[PDB]
Amino acid sequence: GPVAESWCYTQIKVVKFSYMWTINNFSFCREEMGEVIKSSTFSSGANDKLKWCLRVNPKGLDEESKDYLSLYLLLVSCPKSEVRAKFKFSILNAKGEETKAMESQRAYRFVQGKDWGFKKFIRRDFLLDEANGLLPDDKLTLFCEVSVVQDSVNISGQNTMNMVKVPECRLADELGGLWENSRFTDCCLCVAGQEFQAHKAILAARSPVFSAMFEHEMEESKKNRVEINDVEPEVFKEMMCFIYTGKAPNLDKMADDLLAAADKYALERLKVMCEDALCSNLSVENAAEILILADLHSADQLKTQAVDFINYHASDVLETSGWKSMVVSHPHLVAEAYRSLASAQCPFLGPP
Amino acid sequence: GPVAESWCYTQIKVVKFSYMWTINNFSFCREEMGEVIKSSTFSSGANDKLKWCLRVNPKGLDEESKDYLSLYLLLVSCPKSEVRAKFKFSILNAKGEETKAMESQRAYRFVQGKDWGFKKFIRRDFLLDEANGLLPDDKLTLFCEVSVVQDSVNISGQNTMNMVKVPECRLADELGGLWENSRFTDCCLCVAGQEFQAHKAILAARSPVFSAMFEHEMEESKKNRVEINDVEPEVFKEMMCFIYTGKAPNLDKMADDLLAAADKYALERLKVMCEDALCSNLSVENAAEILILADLHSADQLKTQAVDFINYHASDVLETSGWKSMVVSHPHLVAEAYRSLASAQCPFLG
Amino acid sequence: VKFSYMWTINNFSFCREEMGEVIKSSTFSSGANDKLKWCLRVNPKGLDEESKDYLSLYLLLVSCPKSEVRAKFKFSILNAKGEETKAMESQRAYRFVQGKDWGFKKFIRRDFLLDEANGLLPDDKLTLFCEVSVV
Amino acid sequence: GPVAESWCYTQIKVVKFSYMWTINNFSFCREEMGEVIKSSTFSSGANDKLKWCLRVNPKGLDEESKDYLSLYLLLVSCPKSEVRAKFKFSILNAKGEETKAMESQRAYRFVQGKDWGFKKFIRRDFLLDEANGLLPDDKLTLFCEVSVVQDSVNISGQNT
Numbered sequence: 001g002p003v004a005e006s007w008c009y010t011q012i013k014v015v016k017f018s019y020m021w022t023i024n025n026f027s028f029c030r031e032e033m034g035e036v037i038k039s040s041t042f043s044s045g046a047n048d049k050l051k052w053c054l055r056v057n058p059k060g061l062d063e064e065s066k067d068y069l070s071l072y073l074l075l076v077s078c079p080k081s082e083v084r085a086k087f088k089f090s091i092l093n094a095k096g097e098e099t100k101a102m103e104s105q106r107a108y109r110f111v112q113g114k115d116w117g118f119k120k121f122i123r124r125d126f127l128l129d130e131a132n133g134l135l136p137d138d139k140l141t142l143f144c145e146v147s148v149v150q151d152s153v154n155i156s157g158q159n160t161m162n163m164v165k166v167p168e169c170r171l172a173d174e175l176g177g178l179w180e181n182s183r184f185t186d187c188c189l190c191v192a193g194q195e196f197q198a199h200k201a202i203l204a205a206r207s208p209v210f211s212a213m214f215e216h217e218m219e220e221s222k223k224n225r226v227e228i229n230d231v232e233p234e235v236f237k238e239m240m241c242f243i244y245t246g247k248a249p250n251l252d253k254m255a256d257d258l259l260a261a262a263d264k265y266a267l268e269r270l271k272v273m274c275e276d277a278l279c280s281n282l283s284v285e286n287a288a289e290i291l292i293l294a295d296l297h298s299a300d301q302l303k304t305q306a307v308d309f310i311n312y313h314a315s316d317v318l319e320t321s322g323w324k325s326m327v328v329s330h331p332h333l334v335a336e337a338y339r340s341l342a343s344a345q346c347p348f349l350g351p352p
Numbered sequence: 353g354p355v356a357e358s359w360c361y362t363q364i365k366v367v368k369f370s371y372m373w374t375i376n377n378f379s380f381c382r383e384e385m386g387e388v389i390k391s392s393t394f395s396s397g398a399n400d401k402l403k404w405c406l407r408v409n410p411k412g413l414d415e416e417s418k419d420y421l422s423l424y425l426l427l428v429s430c431p432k433s434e435v436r437a438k439f440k441f442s443i444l445n446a447k448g449e450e451t452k453a454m455e456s457q458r459a460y461r462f463v464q465g466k467d468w469g470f471k472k473f474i475r476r477d478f479l480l481d482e483a484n485g486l487l488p489d490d491k492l493t494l495f496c497e498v499s500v501v502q503d504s505v506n507i508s509g510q511n512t513m514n515m516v517k518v519p520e521c522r523l524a525d526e527l528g529g530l531w532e533n534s535r536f537t538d539c540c541l542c543v544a545g546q547e548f549q550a551h552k553a554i555l556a557a558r559s560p561v562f563s564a565m566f567e568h569e570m571e572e573s574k575k576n577r578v579e580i581n582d583v584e585p586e587v588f589k590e591m592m593c594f595i596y597t598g599k600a601p602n603l604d605k606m607a608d609d610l611l612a613a614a615d616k617y618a619l620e621r622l623k624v625m626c627e628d629a630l631c632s633n634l635s636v637e638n639a640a641e642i643l644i645l646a647d648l649h650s651a652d653q654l655k656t657q658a659v660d661f662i663n664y665h666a667s668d669v670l671e672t673s674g675w676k677s678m679v680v681s682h683p684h685l686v687a688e689a690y691r692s693l694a695s696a697q698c699p700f701l702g
Numbered sequence: 703v704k705f706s707y708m709w710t711i712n713n714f715s716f717c718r719e720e721m722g723e724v725i726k727s728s729t730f731s732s733g734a735n736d737k738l739k740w741c742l743r744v745n746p747k748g749l750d751e752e753s754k755d756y757l758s759l760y761l762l763l764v765s766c767p768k769s770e771v772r773a774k775f776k777f778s779i780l781n782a783k784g785e786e787t788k789a790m791e792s793q794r795a796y797r798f799v800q801g802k803d804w805g806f807k808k809f810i811r812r813d814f815l816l817d818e819a820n821g822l823l824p825d826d827k828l829t830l831f832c833e834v835s836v837v
Numbered sequence: 838g839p840v841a842e843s844w845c846y847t848q849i850k851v852v853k854f855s856y857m858w859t860i861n862n863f864s865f866c867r868e869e870m871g872e873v874i875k876s877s878t879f880s881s882g883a884n885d886k887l888k889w890c891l892r893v894n895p896k897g898l899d900e901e902s903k904d905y906l907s908l909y910l911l912l913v914s915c916p917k918s919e920v921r922a923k924f925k926f927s928i929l930n931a932k933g934e935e936t937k938a939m940e941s942q943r944a945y946r947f948v949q950g951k952d953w954g955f956k957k958f959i960r961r962d963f964l965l966d967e968a969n970g971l972l973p974d975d976k977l978t979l980f981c982e983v984s985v986v987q988d989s990v991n992i993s994g995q996n997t
Contacts, residue, residue, distance in 0.1 A: 020356035024364045028501045030436045031799070038801040040508045042358045055801050073803075081988040082919070096353030112727035113743065115577050119568035143356055151918035164628040164653040167621040172523055174557040178503035183567070184538075184553040185681040201551050214536075269519055275517035301516060308513070350363035350507035434769035460769070502769055505800075708841040714847060718921065718944055718986060728845045784838045816862045829838075 009155035016147050017044050021054055023140040024351075027128070033059040033066070041076055053075035054144060056116060059124075067124040073115025073144065075110040083110045089118060091127075092143055094136035107149055146166040172246055177246035188224045189240075194233040198240060206243045209265045231261045242270055251277045256293060263297035275302040282309050288322025295333060307340040314341060357511050357694040359500050364504035365523045371496040373406060379480075379490050382410045394426070404497050411476070421476050423454070425469030427462055435462040437500040439469075444495045446488045502636065524598050527554070527643045529599040531596035543580040557596040561617045587613050604629055608645055627654040634661050640674035647685055656692075663693045705732050707741050707832035708774035708780075714815075715826050721747035721754065740764035742832055743775055743803060747812065755812045760805035761834060763798040764828055769797040777809065778831040786831060795837060843995045851988035854881050858891060858979040862940040863972065864965075865976065866895040870903070878913055888914040891953065891981060896961075904961040908956025910946040920947045920985055928959065931973035935980065937963075944986055 008329055021039045029035070035058060041051040057070040073087050085108060090101035100122050108116045127134050134140075148302045189196040200219065204211035211287055213226070231239070235257040242248045251258065251273060259274035261267075278290060287310055294303035310317060314337075327334050344352070362691075371394065377384070391407035393564075409422035424437060438459045443449065454473045462468055478485055537549035551576070556563040565574060580588065587609045593601045603610060603625060611626035630642055631654050643658040662669050669675050677684055725746065727778045729739040741762050748754035761775050776791035779814075788810055796804045815822050858876050863960040866872070895906040910924050927942035937959050945953045964971055 018356040020358055020360065022359075022361045024362060024499070024504075025366070028364065028438065029364075030364075030501060030504075034801060034802070036801040037362070039360050039362070040358065040506055042360075044357070045512070045514075050585075090354075092353070098354065111723070113741070130750060143354060145356075162628055162632060163657055164624055164631050166625040166628055169524065169598040170558070170621055171527065171596075172521075175523075175554070178553055178557050184556060199536070199551075199553065201530060204529040204535060246521040269521075272517065272519060276518055279516060282646060303518075305513075345359070349365070349509075351359070351361045352363070352365070432769075436769070706839070706841050708838070708844055710844075710846060713851065714849070714985065715945070716851070716923070718849070718985075720943075727847070728993050730843045730845070732842055769847075780838060 005160050006158040009157065010152050011155070012152035013150040014147050015044070015053065015150070017042065017050075017140075019052070019054065019144040019146075021056075021142040021144070023056075023142075025138045026058070026135060026140040027138055029058045031059070032349055037272040039352065047079075049077065049079045050075070050083065050148065052146065054142070055117075056142070061119050065119050068120050069124055070117065070119040070120050071121045071126060071142065072119075073146065074113070074115035076113065078110065078112055081111060083148055084108065085110055085146050087116070087147075088145045089121065090143045090145075091134055092141035092267075094133040096141075098143070099132075099134060107147075108297075123263045173325055176241075176247075179240055186223070187226070189226060189228065190234050191228050191231055191236045196233075196236070196240060200259055203245055207265050207267055208306065230264060232257065235261055239267075239270075239349065242267070248273050252281075255281065259293065259297060259299065259302075263299070271297075271299065272301070275299050278302065279305050282306070284316050285320060286322070287313070287317045288320070288326045291333060291337075292326065292330065295330070295336075310337060311341045313346055359509045359511060361507055362504050363507055364501060367397060367499040367500050367503070369532055371396070371494060373405070373494045375408065375492055377490065378410065378492065387411045387413055392630055399433060402406075402431045404496070404498065406494055408553075413471075417471050418570070419476060420472040420480055421474050422471050423469070423473040424471055425445050425467070427469070428465075430434045430464055430466075431500065432502065433463050435500050437462060437498065437502065440474070440479065440499055441494070443493065443494050446493055447485065451484070460575050503677040528597040528599075531592065538575070539578065540576045541578060541580055541588070541592075543583055544585050546585050548589075548592065552700055555595060557618045559619055562574070582616065583613050584609060590667065591617065593618065601627055607633065611645070611651065615651075622648075622652065624653065627651050630654055633656045634658065636668050637672055638674060639665070639669060640678045643685060644674075644682060647682065659692050662689060666693070703732070703738075703836055705727075705730070705740065705834045705836075707740075707742065707830075707834075709830045709832065710827060711744070711830075712791075712827045714746065714823065716829050717746040719746070721749075722749065724749075726762075733814070734765075735767070737765065737767045737821070738763065738771060738836065740834065741820040742830065743805075753807050756808055757810045757812055757815060758805070758807040759809045759830070759834065760803035762803040763800070766798070766800060769799070773798055773834050773836040775805065775832065775834040777806065779810070779815075779822055780829040780831055782821040784829075787822065789831075791833075838885055840996065841952045842997070843993075846992050846994065847989055848992070849989040850887050851882065852883075852985050852987070854879070854889060854982070854985070856889075856891065856979075856981040860893075860977045860979075862975050863895075863977045864975050868895070870894075870896040871898075872896070875911075885983060886914075886916050887912070887920060891979070893979075894955070902956045905957045905966060906959045906961055907954065907956040908958045908979070909952040910983065911952040912949070915949065917949065918948070921945070922983055922985045924953070924981065926955065926958065927982075928964075928971055929978035929980060931970040933978075936969075936971055938980075944984075953968070965995050981997065 019039075019042050023037070024180065036057050037058065039054040039056075041053050043049075043051050043175050053074050053076050055072045055074050057072075059067070060066050060068055061070045075083065075085075086106070087102050087108075088101065088103040090098040093099045102118060102121070104116070110116070126132060127140070137264035179198070185197045185199040187198060187200060189198045200210070200214045204214060214223075218226070218231075226234075235254045238248065238250050238254060239260060239261055240346035248258075255274045259271060259278060262274060279294075282290065283303070287306070291303070291306045291310065293299075294306050363537075373391075387409060389407045389409050391405060393403060393405040395401070397404050405426050405428065407426065409424060411423060412418035412420070413424075423441075425441070436459070439456055441455075443453075454470060456470065460468045470547040478484060534549045536551070538552040539550055539555070541550055552566060556566055565578070571626050583591070587606060588600055590600065590606065590610055592614050593602075600610075600622065607626045607629040611623065611630065614622040614626055627646070630646070630651075634642060634657075639658055639662055643655065643662065646658055662675075707730055711725065723745065724743045727742045729741050731737070731739055741764055743760045744763055745758045748756040749758035750756075759777055763771060772795045774792055774795050776789065778789035780785040781787045788833075790806065790809070792804070792806075798804065810822075814820065815828075856876075856879055860874075865872070871894070873892050873894055876893075878888050878890050879889050890911050890913050892909045892911050897903055897905050898907045908926055912920065921944040923941050923944045925938060927938035928937040930936045932964075939955065939958070941953070941955075947953065959971075963969065963979075
């Protein structure tokens with residue numbers, strides 16, 4: 001383990017798109033040799049100006065490929081003249097696993113309107129055989145993965161310089177002890193009959209709700225006792241810990257009540273923290289309750305991921321009693337669920 | 353089962369419809385009228401927009417097909433100009449016949465104003481022969497389910513997740529805004545007459561020197577009326593900026609006095625930060641001045657760096673007036689210089 | 703429904719690439735119905751190994767409202783004067799689908815194009831003239 | 838030439854750098870096979886981000902090029918990932934005109950720290966004889982003309 005006086009780091013940026021192309025009732029291939037079936041243009045968010053498409057010859061490109069379905073990748077739109085990429089084609093069987101997954105050894109050069117692919121991809125008989133499982137419900141399930149390389153960039157770091165070294169920011173390190181020791185604070189803070197000691201400055205700096213609460217004539221006379229009963233002390237301690245310190249250690253065990261309290265007190269960052277923590281806990285059985293919580297507390301990101309989840313897994317949630325209470329308690333939730341479900345994945349019977 | 357991101361699916365759903373039609377007196381109809389057969393047309397499909405007609409010719413329309421009986425699918429008008437429909441007519445098993453009956457293996461594209469079908473279905477005498485059991489009550493029922501497979505394009509879906517954003521902590525910028533606003537201030541710090549207002553708890557948490565004076569029972573008077581005279585106002589503002597923000601933006605231009613204030617108020621991080629500023633500023637003219645300042649303020653890292661710099665550049669440093677003044681003013685400083693030049697090096701032959 | 707296309711390539715002797723790549727044009731149509739989008743595809747060298755000393759060209763249909771479109775295309779090269787020379791068409795009405803290319807791989811000899819007395823490469827610029835009729 | 842309804846003028850941008858290099862007292866090259874003597878870094882005004890240089894080995898690179906002067910073009914710095922270019926080298930004579938000018942037909946890809954050149958550029962004794970005059974006053978004048986090709990762009994001009 002040597003120590004280097006200066007170190008370097010050159011990273012060539014790799015971005016990956018993936019594509020899923022199914023062909024229904026594929027034995028009705030509809031045409032003879034020379035038929036090219038295109039697919040829709042696809043891209044990811046970055047940089048979203050790289051449009052790719054797949055072109056399949058079910059019969060074959062040429063007379064050597066008669067018993068060979070051929071699959072090609074064609075780059076339709078690219079802002080630059082050259083993009084180099086490496087592709088991998090695969091076919092899903094009835095279970096769904098990869099089969100005949102073959103890749104490209106080379107990062108081919110791509111231009112506007114250039115296609116690179118495998119003319120010798122798969123035997124026509126090996127696909128057409130039902131016992132191989134490669135045409136489940138006559139659905140040809142292609143699956144493509146493309147990795148584009150960009151220019152690499154040089155970090156060009158250098159250590160063993162600037163001999164005197166400053167410490168890391170001590171602000172949070174010391175102020176985390178401030179709430180814990182509860183020193184030089186003035187005002188009481190009652191939650192469920194349990195009192196804590198806090199001062200107005202940090203609470204007003206980190207929450208507009210308390211900023212509006214303390215300044216409205218109560219600080220002159222009733223500064224000590226404030227009325228809070230919507231929340232419990234075991235979540236309120238974490239509330240004060242996040243307010244004073246800026247960190248949330250015990251977030252997963254209380255991501256519901258902390259979300260409710262942050263929604264109550266306009267804690268934007270804490271609301272996003274509870275959103276991420278609870279959204280990592282998404283599952284089939286607890287979809288109705290998290291949907292209800294997100295709609296109640298106006299969590300935009302959480303409700304977006306929740307409606308995407310319920311549209312993807314609506315086949316197994318409706319039988320649970322959460323949906324059965326949800327329909328009677330929140331009809332608007334059912335309306336929003338139907339509106340989200342009837343437009344994205346099965347809008348107008350395609351796919352059925 | 354891998355996951356991917358579009359679900360293209362090319363839904364190529366087919367349009368099929370049910371149909372009922374009965375033919376009466378099929379045995380002697382050729383002797384009745386002949387070959388030119390006209391039957392009723394029907395409309396089906398999307399709200400009966402599509403037009404179709406099914407009829408059976410009992411004998412060949414021309415001379416060549418007199419051997420094989422005609423089941424021709426007449427198509428006066430088609431739905432779309434391109435219909436690559438592999439038509440598969442069927443019978444709902446009036447008797448047992450699902451093989452040896454001519455069923456289409458390859459069809460033709462149907463265009464507007466053109467009819468397409470097949471002219472050979474079964475041998476005429478073989479059909480007329482009742483011994484094969486192909487005469488159920490002298491009537492045949494048609495269930496023509498036309499299968500157009502042309503409509504396929506396309507549907508699509510983006511199908512993105514992107515997880516959650518998770519913005520960064522901003523306690524530093526928030527506390528800087530708190531210092532700038534000065535809301536609910538607990539103590540008044542007066543420096544050179546000018547009064548700033550600050551919070552007691554944050555100052556005590558950051559600097560032990562401020563922490564101590566707010567604990568020695570000097571509270572009834574020194575809360576609002578603490579005097580701070582040995583510092584400049586701008587250096588006090590920069591030090592309060594370090595205390596509240598945790599950051600020192602303007603530190604590089606005022607290293608020495610800010611180091612002095614940091615030494616006075618025991619801010620170790622600010623002390624080392626001003627030390628770092630001073631260390632990468634050394635020149636032969638004022639290096640002894642830096643050493644004097646570092647020794648005065650007990651800055652050990654900067655002290656060692658300046659001592660080593662002077663040891664490396666001693667041939668030019670000794671000519672400066674600052675060295676000649678430290679020789680008089682700070683003798684043990686030059687003693688440390690000699691110690692770190694001799695004890696920390698050598699032997700060097702002689 | 704007869705389109706027309708005057709598609710121009712400059713500094714062609716700097717063909718920039720070896721055998722087996724394609725310089726596409728941009729999508730073009732007429733005013734009506736302006737939905738059938740077409741594009742030429744020219745390989746400066748041979749598309750195939752046996753063509754090689756050859757200049758292949760195709761017409762490709764990118765966007766189509768209908769399924770299959772019947773059309774007859776005629777390619778030409780406009781010389782230094784500007785007349786239609788090396789003009790050869792397709793007699794058959796070929797069938798065009800989403801992403802089909804039809805044309806002539808053996809369109810013109812590369813040496814016959816690079817001959818400077820022929821005048822088929824004026825100012826290192828080539829002007830292909832395409833006329834496609836859709837029925 | 839009839840008027841087309843729609844047309845497209847496709848513009849493959851090219852830039853050209855010209856370079857003149859003068860080596861005085863070249864016969865005092867002072868070293869054997871394997872010595873490289875570089876030139877100053879050079880570019881044009883726009884975009885001035887592609888920085889070129891020449892490199893010459895007086896005796897040669899390889900055992901095949903003992904009696905061959907070897908000359909290379911080296912791209913010292915370039916912000917883009919790759920740059921495609923065609924170069925042409927020439928040696929000026931005593932009267933100053935081009936002589937033994939030889940070029941490269943294929944545009945080579947250039948990247949950080951890559952060179953491309955002619956190892957068998959000119960016969961060494963062909964240079965060193967006085968009769969051809971390609972070494973006037975023991976001065977060697979090289980003219981390097983390089984062409985960098987860029988992105989093509991489509992304008993899509995539509996007419997009535």
